RNA sequence: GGUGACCACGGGUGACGGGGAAUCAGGGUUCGAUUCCGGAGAGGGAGCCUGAGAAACGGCUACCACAUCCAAGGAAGGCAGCAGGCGCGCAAAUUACCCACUCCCGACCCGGGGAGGUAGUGACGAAAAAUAACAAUACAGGACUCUUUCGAGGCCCUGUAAUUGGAAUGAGUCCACUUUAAAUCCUUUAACGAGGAUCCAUUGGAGGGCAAGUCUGGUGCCAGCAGCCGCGGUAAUUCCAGCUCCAA
């Protein structure tokens, strides 16, 4: 019959208790600190790190010199350090244990632009990137939650034709400067 | 189901087909010819996906219906003709000619040949009798018969038969020592040497090759299609020699080719 | 036309239907997507051809403008693109008209054929009256 | 029955009628979080009240 | 004890399966009694016809009217009571409407003070029961 | 003679089988009508013609049950195909466009295909993701700092109200292109498009479990709430409301 895929999966998981005061707080305090819009985002990257601790874990129950978990395991040190995670010396599958949620984090494209300095808060920087404001490479990101990488972490810039790099000021710019000259002939 | 099929999923095709699963419902059924469907790689998705000369069906059978492809020599406007193992494809309007030989992943790859090599085409015997008259038949893994073969000739060995006038130039004798190739299963497409092969009565018989690594595999008889004789092959080998390698030295070799490259 | 730029990649030549497959991605950096007319003329200036035998398509504009990618197809001679290419690339250029009528009205047709037997004169004028 | 049906919606009906008076429109979303995430990590003053809740009607 | 042996999988599997059946949830869910006892037939809801208005009294620490329509179900015929679930909405509630009924919670068992009604009223007329409280639409006159 | 407590035989199945799905320490428990493979059926049975292949049903013959036309002599049926109705129900969409793609059939590069593709309805479900950001005044807070409470600013961070107060953008109108068989949508790009940015976020709750009010007003064991404990008989943190909070 029909030619479809519907392949899909959730990228989250929702708390197995509602309603504590420690884990409310604590994702709160992860929402403040990384503009989040909701405790969806905070699941999904928590999902996400559940999932390479549990791929971690199965290579480390697997015996060592073992070329599955050679194989696997490089493969997974290699995206870590290669999403800036993990550092380039600490390439061991125990190390992969050890990391948390906050490194995820700082990886996101808002928090990297807030960080290198385009934005003034962290909720200026995810608007600024929801009104495609900002490039990375050549090509112009509006996703927040865009995972940069080590080798891209130097070219986000911004997009040529926002008011910001190149010229084309916005319509409220260019609506005040008529107003302001038809005031004046 | 009240007769023969003539459809194919695009999913129940064969993985070696590399189709995709989004473009198309079905999948371009083989038809009935030398080879079987399960290892054939129909002429459409040869000269569409492969060398990526058409964009679709219709372009495809443009092609074929111009007269331009020549399987084993004769033109053939068929647009789902079972190619199959060790056939040559030659259009000579381009002046390329194409053995179809399994690469290293145990899929068809596109191995260019020259002329001078194209002219001829190796061939695993299937079954030896003798018909009426006392004339000895003979049938090959295609579905070609020839008569009067030289007696030496016994089952699963090699002949090599001549284009243009379908005889025999010469033979392989199945032996120990002999280079060879699986034609299915896990090691579909490794080239190696014939070590030993073992006897099961009322049982299919395996046999242990080793290829030049050393590496040690064993296959069923049936999958075994002699092309060389010692450790020279009689015909131009794909890229890799027919050498298996596990996924981390293609890994690192992928590394090494970035490297180089950039 | 001031900052607009064609380039051609994964180009290759075919005899088999005696034309030449490439992908042409333009580069309109402050622009709309430009029309297949422009990138027609433009890619015959480039490939010195007079721009009626082009024949380009597919074109998809990449995410925030700049970059727009499709396909190009460049024929040795005008007369083998009657020969060997479909009909609505023809009917775009115009070389190919199909004035035709409703696939329904064709099977209701087709139907009526199939319920006079016989009789020329009636199996082609099963139509005329129920129009 | 009892014939003690008469008196369905009764507390409804006698409830006198004040109707909502007109606010400021709530933000939503990512700055409903932020100003939530200010109104518990970013105040904060240690107190002898035990640390009263958001609703404390004190 | 139990038997450990290495081929008494046939004894262990077997007494598995017959003492399975000394549990209420497996023998309800695989006897089929209760499936066919039940008045909505497996249905998680089912329309039906209001035949009168009634009030049940409460259990016996509480002191209350419960607001509850006598209902005949469209399907199979049969008669049950549903609470009507809200402040007034007896009186959005007339004779002989197409009310759909939900269960009442706790599958098939009776909740809180009511006694032995299992229903509830979730439509009326094919409007909200929930829309008709809050006020969101009004009755089709 | 054969088969049976190593469960035959019989009965039930709300049983098509499998690849698989949900749950997810491990072990398991449920679900697989459903797009792939295999089987069966074309209202129920039964019997056949042709053909390589059918016990075919968009073939035929007969019976049983429904049901169409009729000048009453006859004749014609099989949507568990695509649409679309009725009926059943808690429960499921357009009597749309096209063979352009994937393939199939044919005497065949040319015709055909409700296979299939395309669009429509579509909060089954899955992914991403708006509903605001910033600056300066006030009044607070910080290890704030200057003299060692008193006053101020060489700083950092919230909230409340304002000619603030002028920057940024989509959501929508809509030129063109593009997509495409023709289109629609998305992606581009002109022109409008935001200060109650009234271009207005909801659904459930605030005794405990379980996050959040011993607030105010009505009712007074009534109305009602309450999955379970329980609440309600006159200042009810539990009902009905307003405000304020909480969760997503
Ligand atoms: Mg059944
Ligand atoms: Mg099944
Ligand atoms: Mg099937
Ligand atoms: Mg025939
Ligand atoms: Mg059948
Ligand atoms: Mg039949
Ligand atoms: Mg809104
Ligand atoms: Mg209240």
């Given at each position: 019959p029909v030619a479809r895929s519907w392949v899909c999966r959730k990228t989250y998981v929702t708390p197995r208790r509602p309603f504590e005061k420690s884990r409310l707080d604590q994702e709160l305090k992860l929402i403040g600190e990384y503009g989040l819009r909701n405790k969806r985002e905070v699941w999904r990257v928590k999902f996400t790190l559940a999932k390479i601790r549990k791929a971690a874990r199965e290579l480390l129950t697997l015996d060592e010199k073992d070329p599955r978990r050679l194989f696997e395991g490089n493969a997974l040190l290699r995206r870590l350090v290669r999403i800036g995670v993990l550092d380039e010396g600490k390439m061991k599958l125990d190390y992969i244990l050890g990391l948390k949620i906050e490194d995820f984090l700082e990886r996101r494209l808002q928090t990297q632009v807030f960080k290198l300095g385009l934005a003034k808060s962290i909720h200026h920087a995810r608007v600024l990137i929801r009104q495609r404001h900002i490039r990375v490479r050549k090509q112009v990101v509006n996703i927040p939650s865009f995972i940069v990488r080590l080798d891209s972490q130097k070219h986000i810039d911004f997009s040529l034709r926002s008011p910001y790099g190149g010229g084309r000021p916005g319509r409220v710019k260019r609506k005040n400067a008529k107003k302001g000259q038809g005031g004046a002939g | 189901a009240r007769g023969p099929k003539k459809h194919l999923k695009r999913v129940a095709a064969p993985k070696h087909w590399m189709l995709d699963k989004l473009t198309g419902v079905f999948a371009p059924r083989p038809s009935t010819g030398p080879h079987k469907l399960r290892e054939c790689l129909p002429l459409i998705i040869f000269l569409r996906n492969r060398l990526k000369y058409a964009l679709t069906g219709d372009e495809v059978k443009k092609i074929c219906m111009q007269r331009f492809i020549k399987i084993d020599g004769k033109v053939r406007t068929d647009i789902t003709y079972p190619a199959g193992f060790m056939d040559v494809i030659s259009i000579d309007k381009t002046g390329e000619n194409f053995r179809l030989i399994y690469d290293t992943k145990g899929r068809f790859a596109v191995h260019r040949i020259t002329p001078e090599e194209a002219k001829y085409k190796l061939c695993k015997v299937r079954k030896i009798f003798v018909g009426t008259k006392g004339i000895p038949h003979l049938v090959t893994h295609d579905a070609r018969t020839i008569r009067y073969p030289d007696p030496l000739i016994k089952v699963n060995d090699t002949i090599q038969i001549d284009l243009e006038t379908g005889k025999i130039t010469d033979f392989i004798k199945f032996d120990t020592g002999n280079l060879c190739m699986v034609t299915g299963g896990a090691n579909l497409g490794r080239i190696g040497v014939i070590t030993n092969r073992e006897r099961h009565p009322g049982s299919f018989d395996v046999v242990h090759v080793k290829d030049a690594n050393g590496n040690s595999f064993a296959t069923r008889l049936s999958n075994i299609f002699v092309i060389g004789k010692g450790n020279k092959p009689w015909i131009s080998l794909p890229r890799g020699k027919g050498i298996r390698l596990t996924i981390a030295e293609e890994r690192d070799k992928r590394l090494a080719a970035k490297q180089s490259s950039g | 036309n001031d900052t607009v730029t064609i380039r051609t990649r994964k180009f290759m030549t075919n005899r088999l239907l005696q034309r030449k497959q490439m992908v042409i991605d333009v580069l309109h950096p402050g622009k709309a997507t430009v029309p297949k007319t422009e990138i027609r003329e433009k890619l015959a200036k480039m490939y010195k051809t007079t721009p009626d035998v082009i024949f380009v398509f597919g074109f998809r504009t990449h995410f925030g403008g700049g970059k727009t990618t499709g396909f190009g197809m460049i024929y040795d001679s005008l007369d083998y693109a009657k020969k060997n290419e479909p009909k609505h690339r023809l009917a775009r250029h115009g070389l190919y008209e199909k004035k035709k009528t409703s696939r329904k009205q064709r099977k209701e047709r087709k139907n009526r054929m199939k319920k006079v037997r016989g009789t020329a004169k009636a199996n082609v004028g099963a139509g005329k009256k129920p129009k | 029955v009892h014939g003690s049906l008469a008196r369905a919606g009764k507390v409804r009906g006698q409830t006198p009628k004040v109707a909502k008076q007109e606010k400021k429109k709530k933000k939503t979303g990512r700055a409903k979080r932020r100003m939530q995430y200010n109104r518990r990590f970013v105040n904060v003053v240690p107190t002898f009240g035990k640390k009263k809740g958001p609703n404390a009607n004190s | 004890?139990?038997?450990?042996?290495?081929?008494?999988?046939?004894?262990?599997?077997?007494?598995?399966?017959?003492?399975?059946?000394?549990?209420?949830?497996?023998?309800?869910?695989?006897?089929?009694?209760?499936?066919?006892?039940?008045?909505?037939?497996?249905?998680?809801?089912?329309?039906?016809?209001?035949?009168?208005?009634?009030?049940?009294?409460?259990?016996?620490?509480?002191?209350?009217?419960?607001?509850?329509?006598?209902?005949?179900?469209?399907?199979?015929?049969?008669?049950?009571?549903?609470?009507?679930?809200?402040?007034?909405?007896?009186?959005?509630?007339?004779?002989?409407?197409?009310?759909?009924?939900?269960?009442?919670?706790?599958?098939?068992?009776?909740?809180?003070?009511?006694?032995?009604?299992?229903?509830?009223?979730?439509?009326?007329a094919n409007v909200s029961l929930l829309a008709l409280y809050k006020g969101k639409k009004e009755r089709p006159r």
């Open positions: - | - | - | - | 004890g139990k038997c450990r042996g290495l081929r008494t999988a046939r004894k262990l599997r077997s007494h598995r399966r017959d003492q399975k059946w000394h549990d209420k949830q497996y023998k309800k869910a695989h006897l089929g009694t209760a499936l066919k006892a039940n008045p909505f037939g497996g249905a998680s809801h089912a329309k039906g016809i209001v035949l009168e208005k009634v009030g049940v009294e409460a259990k016996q620490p509480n002191s209350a009217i419960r607001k509850c329509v006598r209902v005949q179900l469209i399907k199979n015929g049969k008669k049950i009571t549903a609470f009507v679930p809200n402040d007034g909405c007896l009186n959005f509630i007339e004779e002989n409407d197409e009310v759909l009924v939900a269960g009442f919670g706790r599958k098939g068992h009776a909740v809180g003070d009511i006694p032995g009604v299992r229903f509830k009223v979730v439509k009326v």
